[PDB]
Amino acid sequence: KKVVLGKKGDTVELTCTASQKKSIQFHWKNSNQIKILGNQGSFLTKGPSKLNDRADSRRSLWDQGNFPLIIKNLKIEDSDTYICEVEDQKEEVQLLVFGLTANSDTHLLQGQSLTLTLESPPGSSPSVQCRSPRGKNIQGGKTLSVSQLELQDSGTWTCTVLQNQKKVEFKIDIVVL
Amino acid sequence: WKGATTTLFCASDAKAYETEVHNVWATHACVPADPNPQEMVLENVTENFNMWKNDMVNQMQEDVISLWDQSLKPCVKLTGGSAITQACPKVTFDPIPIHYCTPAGYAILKCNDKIFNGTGPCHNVSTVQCTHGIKPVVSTQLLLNGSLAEGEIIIRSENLTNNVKTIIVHLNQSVEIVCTRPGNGGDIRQAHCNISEDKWNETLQRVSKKLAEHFQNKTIKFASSSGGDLEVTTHSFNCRGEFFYCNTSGLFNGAYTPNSSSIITIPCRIKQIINMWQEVGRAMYAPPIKGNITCKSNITGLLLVRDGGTEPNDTETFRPGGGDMRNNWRSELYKYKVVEI
């Protein structure tokens, strides 16, 4: 089916279309059947879901039968299967949110060990790899690290998270100098 | 006869040299209300009704939209993205009852069962030329100034198992609410509503019981609106031309079981900038007039939505809903159906 990937703190826009029509009723549910967001005539309503104050929709598109679920400042836990119910239809999209963090301080040096953590949902088993400034990559599970750091181990580390093929990228700066 | 659609006309007791806006709309758009409404019981007949598919609701919506569009002129209006401005004089605004009438070749069938819920067969059916008079009050959360159920409180929904479906609660005793923006009146846009604590408590207690009947083995509780636009999160309504937003937190708070002051007080704001109900867009009016801006209303209905959810947790919780004004008209049109003779 359809899977959408998103990075922590980013904003995502899940799509939904009514059989090429007009402005009509729609609702977005999670897999737990909790109501997220929908319309009441011309107004937007929002249900008792965890995502409450960050869900939004693009009202101007409603005439054209587009009813997106917009989720701002994505949290890991937003990862779920979302259902948009329109007229007779049920459309499903699975959201996976990941974050990639450097669980060390900001300023490291010398022979310290740098250790990167993937924050992932429990539906996830993504593959993770991080490219050093020197082009050295390091494949890894959920917490990949470097044995002993170095001076040129500073700069812009580029990390790719693969899942459903399909990918997201985390540029992380590390400073050892 | 045979179910049908056709082009209704309206009827009212509008005065024609009155400047109030509903009066001005009706006097050109409607017929004078017949002094002698003919109603004829049909012995030996049963009819199916479905309030949820009643095109009479469509036409009423269409009228109320036209009325608003012609009567309440915002200084700024946003529609296609296309902003426009125009004169926005203050206006005189107080809904009058409007009747819906069928022309020759057609008749309106009216269900008189006191138990009627809006769908399924009706056993005491009469025929009329017009509906009773129906005030087009535009509101969310609380249905104001409607008629009262005659027997017991009634629960209406197109589908109670579906938690997206708005539940219309038809009261059978009203609870007065007085909302006012005081003259002096430090914050000009500050306001509050008073509701008899005992009367509200009694009302929610009984609604819970009804609700318990459709959701057996459930604790029934009520909670604040769950968010969305301010027009829907608060109890909003227009009062003397101003758009009130009244916080109902202190009205939907916990469980209500058979056994501050005597008065619940609810804070309200008057807003100039509003989301439009007629269509997707925003309007901007002038600041509130002077003096006491007060509306005293009868809460005669409720608009609720049930949380639902595949929780093993088994207490049903209900929040104030609304926003689709077709439900407002459905709460009054539910016992009428147009029929071609």
Numbering used by the authors:
A (entry chain C): 1 to 177
B (entry chain A): 45 to 124, 198 to 301, 323 to 397, 409 to 490
Extract from the study:
Initially synthesized as a heavily glycosylated gp160 precursor, the human immunodeficiency virus type I (HIV-1) envelope glycoprotein (Env) is cleaved enzymatically by cellular proteases before binding to the cell surface as two non-covalently associated subunits: gp120 and gp41. Gp120 is the receptor binding subunit2 that interacts subsequently with the primary receptor CD4 and a co-receptor (either CCR5 or CXCR4) and undergoes a series of entry-related conformational changes. In addition to its critical role in the life cycle of HIV-1, Env is also the sole target on the surface of HIV-1 virions for antibody-mediated neutralization.
To define precisely the conformational change of HIV-1 CRF07_BC gp120 induced only by the engagement of soluble CD4, ruling out an influence of co-receptor mimics, we solved the crystal structure of the HIV-1 gp120 core with an extended stem of variable loop 3 (V3)1920, which is designated as coreV3e, in complex with the N-terminal two domains (D1D2) of CD4921 (hereafter referred to as CD4D1D2). The complex structure was solved at 2.47 Å. CD4 D1 is bound into a pocket formed at the nexus of three gp120 domains, in which Phe43 plays a critical role in the interaction between gp120 and CD49. A second binding interface between HIV-1 gp120 and CD4, comprising residues T90, N234-linked N-acetylglucosamine (NAG), H240, and E269 from gp120; and residues T81, E92, P122, and S125 from CD4, was identified. Specifically, within the interface, the side chain of gp120 T90 forms double hydrogen bonds with the carboxylate group of CD4 E92. Additionally, the side chain of H240 makes a hydrogen bond with the hydroxyl group of T81, and the Oε2 atom of E269 forms a hydrogen bond with the side chain of S125. Furthermore, the N234-linked NAG packs closely with P122. Compared with the canonical binding surface, interactions at the second binding interface comprise primarily hydrogen bonds and are therefore much weaker. This second interface buries a surface area of 471 Å2, which is much smaller than the 940 Å2 in the primary gp120-CD4 interface. Residual mutagenesis on this interface was harmful to Env-mediated cell-cell fusion and pseudotyped HIV-1 infection, indicating that this interface is important for HIV-1 fusion and entry. Superimposition of the CD4 molecules from the two complexes revealed that the ibalizumab epitope is positioned on the same region of CD4 as that of the non-canonical binding interface engaged with HIV-1 gp120.
